[PDB]
């Protein structure tokens, strides 16, 4: 959702919010009901949520920032409800990932952001980082907290 400011939030943004938040909750809800049906209490599914660090700080994103920030409620509800044996949350705050070439992402200003001391990532490095979160050590933490 691009150049959708708060004046312009309509049908596309309300649908996007359903894709990116309410139907994410309904899909973890569904895997909890299927795992419980079969009394599976010891094989939790690690949910990896794509979070943003940038909630509202650009604008024109429609309800993207509302979508992203409301998944941070799952780090609290994991303690406060009855689905922690079925589900574990591993929220990944994904950072600057370069696309293909020139037009893709904002590739032309990557070099300039890196001069500040920030690091950007190839898609293959960002893939690496997120497959990190599925290693046996950080699967082990997820299941604690």
């Amino acid at each position: 959702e691009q150049g959708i400011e708060l004046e312009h939030i309509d049908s596309k943004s309300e649908f996007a919010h359903r894709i990116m938040l309410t139907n994410i909750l309904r899909m973890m809800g569904c895997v909890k009901k299927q795992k419980s049906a079969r009394g599976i209490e010891t094989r939790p599914a690690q949910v990896i949520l794509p979070m943003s660090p940038n909630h509202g700080t650009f604008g024109g994103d429609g309800m993207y920032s509302e979508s992203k920030l409301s998944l941070e409620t799952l780090f609290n509800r994991w303690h406060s409800e009855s689905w922690a044996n079925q589900l574990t949350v591993c929220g990944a705050i994904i950072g600057w990932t370069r696309g293909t070439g020139l037009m893709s992402a904002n590739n032309i200003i990557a070099e300039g952001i890196e001069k500040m001391g920030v690091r950007t990532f190839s898609q293959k490095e960002m893939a690496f980082n997120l497959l990190g979160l599925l290693t046996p050590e950080v699967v082990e933490l997820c299941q604690k907290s």
Binding site: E41, T42, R43, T88, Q143
Partner: protein
């Protein structure tokens, strides 16, 4: 040991309140200690049975 048939004792588990206590107590202990239902084993007689050691309750079962 000798006679060990599928569904053994399950006729008496439908009717009897006193049987039900015995099986339900045992089945809940095996589930929380060794991560399997003995009732599933007796009723269905599966060929394979994977215990999983995932989660707080799974690490406890793995220590057993």
């Amino acid at each position: 040991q000798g006679s060990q048939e599928q569904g053994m004792g399950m006729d008496l588990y439908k009717t009897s309140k006193a049987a039900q206590d015995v099986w339900n107590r045992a089945d809940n202990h095996f589930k929380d200690t060794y991560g399997f239902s003995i009732l599933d084993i007796v009723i269905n007689n599966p060929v394979n049975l994977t215990i999983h050691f995932g989660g707080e309750k799974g690490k406890r079962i793995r220590e057993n």
